[PDB]
Amino acid sequence: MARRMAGRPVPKGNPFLDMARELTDNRALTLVKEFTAPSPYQQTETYGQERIRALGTIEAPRVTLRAPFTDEQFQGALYAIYRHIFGNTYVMESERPTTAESQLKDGRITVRGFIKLLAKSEVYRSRFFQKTSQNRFIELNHKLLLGRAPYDQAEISAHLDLWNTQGYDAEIDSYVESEEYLENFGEDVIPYFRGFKYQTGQSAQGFNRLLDLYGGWAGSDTDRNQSGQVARLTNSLVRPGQVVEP
């Protein structure tokens, strides 16, 4: 009598019984269990950066040098600058300019002016200009003074014509006095590789091109290679998508 008091009989053999047990029995707790389950393609917080070579360069803190500095942040900012601008190439103690550092320490020039002086220095020339074609020089200038790769071929054309008509000093000034450097780094921030995180206005390719330029935390823009500092992005810029064989 009590069993019949439960309700009218329901026909047996329903194939949806397991679905009912899942949708009915403790839905919230079960749902938490599936929500917090690990994903079968396991990716850490920094799986993408470690999959690139460039995690050490993103985790690196931004270094700034404001005029009232005492001693040691200066000695660190000099290391950071000579590491970035010269592209992780060794700068022997003779090559390091003392006059520019004294100017920076006094404060007559900001960090941006010091970057300009180093870019016009003879080390920067002898490494990146004098031994390389104009394409490689423009790539290196973008990578070192802007932190980004070139976005398109019109940049190469414009900078090559600017050089051919006005010289190396104007070519360098077009990078440092550009609005992009001033907005991104300004007067007092050391340049850094900012192309790894999406920078407003970039093409899709700028990321791949910066990856091609990077070459790891150990690598550098040496020019002492067996090759002799060839240009990397010659065909990725004018044939951005396709590939051609001779």
């Binding site: 839905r27 749902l31 000695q75 290391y79 950071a80």
Partner: protein
């Protein structure tokens, strides 16, 4: 991440030097209170379900309308998803305790928090209330230094929400 050890290593590397006495003194302090931090992590891990469930009930208690039908908080899906979010926050508080720094919070929760909230119309005040509740309970759970260090990470999260 930004531990004590990792931040020290980064600041010594950016200057291209070895670790001098200040760095090792900071690392010694970090290793020295690793024990209260690990003990607070052990407590906040053991008393997991109680903390999460009480926090969810506190969110509803201070936010009545959220439970009302036809909107954000109603539905067992949103209920379980709230529980998952609070489990995330507590998980990263204990991660920060273990890592003696705000590395895990800043990497997972804190960075990208506000854009994602505004995109999903999640209110920060709900999570602030849940973390205030967790603050209240972990006040009881923990005594001495573990109490203070936990509370540091909780209100760091609360401030980032604010």
């Amino acid at each position: 991440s930004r531990t004590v050890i990792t931040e020290v290593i980064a600041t010594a590397d950016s200057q291209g030097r070895f670790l001098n006495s200040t760095e090792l003194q900071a690392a010694f302090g970090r290793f020295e209170r690793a024990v209260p931090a690990i003990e607070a992590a052990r407590a906040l891990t053991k008393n997991q379900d109680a903390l999460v469930k009480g926090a969810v009930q506190a969110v509803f208690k201070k936010f009545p309308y959220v439970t009302q039908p036809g909107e954000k908080g109603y539905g067992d899906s949103n209920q379980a998803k709230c529980a998952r979010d609070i489990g995330y926050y507590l998980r990263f508080i204990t991660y920060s305790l273990v890592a003696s720094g705000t590395g895990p919070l800043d990497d997972y929760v804190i960075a990208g928090l506000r854009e994602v909230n505004r995109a999903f119309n999640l209110n920060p005040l709900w999570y602030i209330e849940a973390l205030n509740y967790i603050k209240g309970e972990t006040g009881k759970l923990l005594s001495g230094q573990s109490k203070t260090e936990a509370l540091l990470y909780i209100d760091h999260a609360i401030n980032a929400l604010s």
